[PDB]
Amino acid sequence: ITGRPEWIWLALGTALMGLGTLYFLVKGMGVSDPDAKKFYAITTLVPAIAFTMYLSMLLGYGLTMVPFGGEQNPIYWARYADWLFTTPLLLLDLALLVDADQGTILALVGADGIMIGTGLVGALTKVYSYRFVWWAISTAAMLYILYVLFFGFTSKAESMRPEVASTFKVLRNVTVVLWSAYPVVWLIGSEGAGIVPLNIETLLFMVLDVSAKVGFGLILLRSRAIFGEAE
Amino acid sequence: ITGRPEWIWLALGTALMGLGTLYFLVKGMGVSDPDAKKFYAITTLVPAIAFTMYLSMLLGYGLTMVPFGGEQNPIYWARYADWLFTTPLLLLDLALLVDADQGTILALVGADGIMIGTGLVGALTKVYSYRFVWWAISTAAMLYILYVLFFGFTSKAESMRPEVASTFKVLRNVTVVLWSAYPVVWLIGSEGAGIVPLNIETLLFMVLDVSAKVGFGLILLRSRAIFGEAE
Amino acid sequence: ITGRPEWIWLALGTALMGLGTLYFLVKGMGVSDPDAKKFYAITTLVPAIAFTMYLSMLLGYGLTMVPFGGEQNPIYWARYADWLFTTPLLLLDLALLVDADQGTILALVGADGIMIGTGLVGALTKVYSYRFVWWAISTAAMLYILYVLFFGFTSKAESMRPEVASTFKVLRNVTVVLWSAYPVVWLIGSEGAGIVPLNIETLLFMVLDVSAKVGFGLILLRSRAIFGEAE
Numbered sequence: 001i002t003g004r005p006e007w008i009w010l011a012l013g014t015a016l017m018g019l020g021t022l023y024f025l026v027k028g029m030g031v032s033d034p035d036a037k038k039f040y041a042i043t044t045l046v047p048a049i050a051f052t053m054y055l056s057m058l059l060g061y062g063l064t065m066v067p068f069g070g071e072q073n074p075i076y077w078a079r080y081a082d083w084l085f086t087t088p089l090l091l092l093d094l095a096l097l098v099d100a101d102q103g104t105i106l107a108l109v110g111a112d113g114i115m116i117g118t119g120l121v122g123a124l125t126k127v128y129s130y131r132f133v134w135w136a137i138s139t140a141a142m143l144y145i146l147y148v149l150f151f152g153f154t155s156k157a158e159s160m161r162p163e164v165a166s167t168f169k170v171l172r173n174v175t176v177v178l179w180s181a182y183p184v185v186w187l188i189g190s191e192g193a194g195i196v197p198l199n200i201e202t203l204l205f206m207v208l209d210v211s212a213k214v215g216f217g218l219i220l221l222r223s224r225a226i227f228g229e230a231e
Numbered sequence: 232i233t234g235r236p237e238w239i240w241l242a243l244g245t246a247l248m249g250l251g252t253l254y255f256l257v258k259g260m261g262v263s264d265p266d267a268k269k270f271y272a273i274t275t276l277v278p279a280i281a282f283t284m285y286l287s288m289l290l291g292y293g294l295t296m297v298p299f300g301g302e303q304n305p306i307y308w309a310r311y312a313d314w315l316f317t318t319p320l321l322l323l324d325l326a327l328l329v330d331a332d333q334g335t336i337l338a339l340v341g342a343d344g345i346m347i348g349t350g351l352v353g354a355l356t357k358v359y360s361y362r363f364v365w366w367a368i369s370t371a372a373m374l375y376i377l378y379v380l381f382f383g384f385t386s387k388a389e390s391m392r393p394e395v396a397s398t399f400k401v402l403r404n405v406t407v408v409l410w411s412a413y414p415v416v417w418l419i420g421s422e423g424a425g426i427v428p429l430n431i432e433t434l435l436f437m438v439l440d441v442s443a444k445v446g447f448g449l450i451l452l453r454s455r456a457i458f459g460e461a462e
Numbered sequence: 463i464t465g466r467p468e469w470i471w472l473a474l475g476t477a478l479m480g481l482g483t484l485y486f487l488v489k490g491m492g493v494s495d496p497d498a499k500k501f502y503a504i505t506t507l508v509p510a511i512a513f514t515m516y517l518s519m520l521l522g523y524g525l526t527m528v529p530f531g532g533e534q535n536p537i538y539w540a541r542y543a544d545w546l547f548t549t550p551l552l553l554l555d556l557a558l559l560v561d562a563d564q565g566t567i568l569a570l571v572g573a574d575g576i577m578i579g580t581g582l583v584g585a586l587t588k589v590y591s592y593r594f595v596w597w598a599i600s601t602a603a604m605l606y607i608l609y610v611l612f613f614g615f616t617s618k619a620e621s622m623r624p625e626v627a628s629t630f631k632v633l634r635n636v637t638v639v640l641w642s643a644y645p646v647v648w649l650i651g652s653e654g655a656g657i658v659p660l661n662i663e664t665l666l667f668m669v670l671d672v673s674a675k676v677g678f679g680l681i682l683l684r685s686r687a688i689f690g691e692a693e
């Protein structure tokens with residue numbers, strides 16, 4: 001484990017995702033509202049999945065070597081197995097908050113799968129220049145997601161209860177800022193141009209992951225928007 | 232790329248799926264009917280997924296070598312990753328058109344997963360004679376799907392609006408004819424008996440894919456069956 | 463095939479899953495109740511999936527070698543591909559029986575995916591002591607599932623029709639007893655401590671699989687709880 005300088009950030013990430021999972025699990029014990037139960041189930045699964053994948057990276061299972069640039073490059077593939085399941089769950093939290101229609105939910109989840117799937121292909125591609133073709137396709141899929149979150153959901157939240165509109169607006173802004181950083185870290189990190197070393201890259205993804213999952217969840221599960229209007 | 236004679240058909244397929252995706256995306260911009268939005272989302276995702284997998288084959292990522300018959304045989308595995316997601320989406324288009332019940336939808340999607348999954352196992356199997364055992368199981372799963380589309384959905388469409396009944400009947404006939412060709416191309420192509428060479432096999436799958444996805448989508452999204460009855 | 467002593471139990475399992483699939487398929491022909499159709503579709507898919515994965519193990523495709531303990535250990539990875547899809551389908555049978563809320567269904571299916579996913583990682587892990595870390599995480603996920611089936615569903619079934627309450631109680635008890643045996647067989651078998659040899663381990667999993675899928679299905683599909691109350 002300790003033979004890799006980035007191990008400290010993988011261990012911290014593992015701990016923070018595990019602690020986040022347990023807090024949400026305990027906090028959700030005393031909840032019977034069927035609407036609130038939906039948000040607790042979605043939001044608790046997110047850091048639980050991330051916990052297992054951070055642990056796999058810490059123990060060395062989620063790491064492979066990819067030859068490109070005449071070098072064997074360490075690629076943590078477990079990140080994409082994490083994101084494949086956690087990013088659509090996070091979008092479902094937002095879509096259920098605004099009572100989005102089914103067709104829009106399917107478009108979001110499908111574009112998200114394309115985003116993560118093409119990012120994985122780009123991470124494992126051995127022809128250096130082709131890695132950035134996949135990065136560009138994946139980034140186009142992300143821009144579609146961000147467009148929908150702004151010019152489809154925002155207008156839908158305003159016609160909703162005030163507390164669900166204000167909570168959505170906050171979580172929307174958090175998501176757009178944090179998610180946009182991921183393609184940048186990829187491009188300048190060891191998967192892309194190799195400007196930033198792997199140990200610093202790992203620290204950046206850990207800050208982003210914890211903020212986008214545990215920070216996101218703390219804002220959502222403390223809001224009254226997750227409960228139905230009741231007397 | 233150009234070192235493979237089949238590259239021209241992979242490049243054409245990539246272009247036609249990309250163009251198809253963009254047309255459906257633009258055409259769906261001016262749509263607010265929640266029913267129509269469902270069909271546009273399903274139908275636009277189909278060629279978008281196929282685009283990415285054709286590109287992976289063009290660039291050489293979606294290709295592996297499988298030893299059988301005393302030879303290293305080029306097997307494009309990316310086809311099955313495509314079909315795993317696009318064939319159930321196409322069946323969902325048909326099932327939603329006739330307002331099929333949930334139990335029937337699950338049976339269709341499950342049989343479809345078995346069809347594609349066993350076809351993938353057959354494509355990667357190293358014992359030559361066993362490849363055709365998997366082909367037979369996969370073909371049995373397809374025949375179940377075709378039976379349901381005829382002796383379960385057809386009777387359901389007649390009790391529906393006339394425009395949804397006539398549109399379903401057309402898309403049903405297109406699907407049964409085109410899908411039935413796939414097991415035949417597999418059997419006589421490089422995955423099976425090896426009668427037809429890979430470059431011709433690739434041309435045939437490209438014609439079938441574009442017809443079953445973009446041609447299918449053009450018929451559906453030009454129909455009024457996708458809109459609810461409104462004044 | 464016959465070069466492996468466990469082949470006899472893989473062949474028996476294949477036959478019993480295939481026969482089970484055909485019986486459920488025939489029995490479900492004469493069913494039009496939309497509620498009953500749901501249970502028949504879920505319950506017939508379970509042994510059909512298991513059939514294909516037992517066949518892959520029989521023919522040698524679903525087997526790999528994992529080095530640990532200074533030895534190349536035969537690991538049947540196809541079991542986890544089976545369980546990944548069949549265990550959530552079995553939980554869906556139970557959840558639909560008691561009309562569970564959506565949030566609870568998602569929590570069950572998500573915990574089940576974590577259970578199977580971490581068990582697969584543990585089966586393929588090359589550092590011997592780490593294999594049991596994954597076993598423990600997977601077992602914690604199972605205990606969560608069992609808790610929900612007892613202290614969330616049981617109370618919900620009592621407020622239901624008497625026949626659905628008594629049928630659920632029976633299937634609940636069958637599930638908790640049979641599922642609990644799996645982590646024990648893993649721990650003492652070739653994936654874990656290696657006390658029980660592989661051929662005996664394979665026999666035990668076959669008895670458990672057939673009971674948990676075909677036996678489970680025979681109890682459910684003979685009950686009147688799967689039909690709506692009708693005159």
Ligand SMILES: CC(C)CCC[C@@H](C)CCC[C@@H](C)CCC[C@@H](C)CCOC[C@@H](CO)OCC[C@H](C)CCC[C@H](C)CCC[C@H](C)CCCC(C)C
Nearest residue numbers: 109110113114117118120121124280283295308311312316
């Ligand atoms: C509606 C939305 C959900 C739609 C989703 C969008 C999606 C279509 C976007 C594209 C996804 C696609 C790129 C997934 C590729 C997975 C692949 C990286 C797995 C590893 O295989 C890659 C190479 C080794 O580098 O295999 C070496 C050769 C091996 C012999 C490969 C044989 C196994 C194949 C991988 C079998 C295909 C399985 C499916 C891809 C499983 C789904 C994986 C997940 C990442 C989507």
Ligand SMILES: CC(C)CCC[C@@H](C)CCC[C@@H](C)CCC[C@@H](C)CCOC[C@@H](CO)OCC[C@H](C)CCC[C@H](C)CCC[C@H](C)CCCC(C)C
Nearest residue numbers: 340341344345348349351352355511514526539542543547
């Ligand atoms: C309700 C419906 C959706 C049900 C679906 C029906 C489905 C059950 C039908 C059978 C599907 C099954 C054959 C999928 C097999 C995937 C497999 C080809 C992936 C590549 O692995 C094959 C060998 C190399 O040749 O791995 C070499 C050895 C490696 C060490 C393998 C270890 C990884 C395992 C593959 C882990 C299992 C992952 C799941 C199979 C992922 C789903 C893939 C998709 C193709 C279903």
Ligand SMILES: CC(C)CCC[C@@H](C)CCC[C@@H](C)CCC[C@@H](C)CCOC[C@@H](CO)OCC[C@H](C)CCC[C@H](C)CCC[C@H](C)CCCC(C)C
Nearest residue numbers: 049052064077080081085571572575576579580582583586
């Ligand atoms: C809501 C719920 C459904 C959530 C589900 C819970 C889930 C997150 C729990 C953890 C699942 C995770 C451990 C799955 C790992 C699959 C992995 C074993 C496949 C084989 O790859 C392992 C190594 C060889 O030993 O690959 C060698 C290196 C290769 C180069 C690997 C590159 C391919 C990657 C495997 C791509 C990721 C694909 C996804 C993991 C596909 C889903 C598989 C299924 C088992 C979940």
Ligand SMILES: *C/C=C(C)/C=C/C=C(C)/C=C/C1=C(C)CCCC1(C)C
Nearest residue numbers: 119138139142179182183186209212
């Ligand atoms: C909890 C994890 C989250 C919210 C991860 C989000 C990840 C992304 C938005 C990743 C995007 C990428 C691109 C847009 C292209 C480059 C490759 C990716 C996958 C890093």
Ligand SMILES: *C/C=C(C)/C=C/C=C(C)/C=C/C1=C(C)CCCC1(C)C
Nearest residue numbers: 350369370373410413414417440443
């Ligand atoms: C857009 C792609 C489509 C509609 C693909 C359809 C593919 C099939 C219907 C494939 C069927 C197969 C068999 C029936 C057995 C032989 C292997 C397959 C997977 C080619």
Ligand SMILES: *C/C=C(C)/C=C/C=C(C)/C=C/C1=C(C)CCCC1(C)C
Nearest residue numbers: 581600601604641644645648671674
């Ligand atoms: C039809 C198959 C069924 C119902 C299989 C159930 C399997 C389990 C409940 C497996 C559980 C495991 C653990 C709890 C940890 C050890 C590894 C597993 C996956 C065997």
Ligand SMILES: CCCCCCCCCCCCCCC
Nearest residue numbers: 181182184185195196197200204
């Ligand atoms: C979206 C965030 C990207 C900003 C990356 C900042 C990295 C600064 C760290 C110093 C770079 C290390 C280079 C010298 C080793």
Ligand SMILES: CCCCCCCCCCCCCCC
Nearest residue numbers: 016019020023210211214215218
């Ligand atoms: C009462 C609110 C705080 C509860 C404690 C939460 C502990 C989980 C770890 C959170 C750290 C990361 C927060 C986002 C920066």
Ligand SMILES: CCCCCCCCCCCCCCC
Nearest residue numbers: 412413415416426427428431435
């Ligand atoms: C379902 C369509 C299958 C028909 C295949 C027709 C192939 C004819 C092309 C000529 C065969 C090439 C053999 C000589 C190289």
Ligand SMILES: CCCCCCCCCCCCCCC
Nearest residue numbers: 247250251254441442445446449
């Ligand atoms: C107005 C209808 C035609 C629009 C142009 C569609 C261009 C997408 C490519 C379609 C070619 C394949 C059609 C099926 C044979």
Ligand SMILES: CCCCCCCCCCCCCCC
Nearest residue numbers: 643644646647657658659662666
């Ligand atoms: C949950 C069931 C686990 C019980 C396992 C009993 C196995 C007894 C078979 C004899 C053990 C073989 C050891 C000598 C070869």
Ligand SMILES: CCCCCCCCCCCCCCC
Nearest residue numbers: 478481482485672673676677680
């Ligand atoms: C009339 C009920 C029996 C029908 C025959 C079922 C045959 C399928 C194989 C069942 C054997 C396994 C039963 C569970 C132990």
Ligand SMILES: CCCCCCCCCCCCCC
Nearest residue numbers: 315316319320323336340344
């Ligand atoms: C194995 C991959 C299957 C999933 C394909 C994605 C489409 C799923 C459609 C689900 C239809 C709704 C069923 C109720």
Ligand SMILES: CCCCCCCCCCCCCC
Nearest residue numbers: 546547550551554567571575
């Ligand atoms: C990782 C594979 C999980 C999918 C298994 C297929 C069954 C899914 C059941 C979904 C139940 C409906 C939830 C609302």
Ligand SMILES: CCCCCCCCCCCCC
Nearest residue numbers: 139143146147150180183184
């Ligand atoms: C185009 C939709 C408007 C909202 C999206 C904001 C774009 C942020 C740019 C992200 C940069 C990634 C490289």
Ligand SMILES: CCCCCCCCCCCCC
Nearest residue numbers: 370374377378381411414415
């Ligand atoms: C048996 C259901 C009737 C409709 C299915 C038509 C069968 C077409 C044969 C396809 C040939 C594939 C080898």
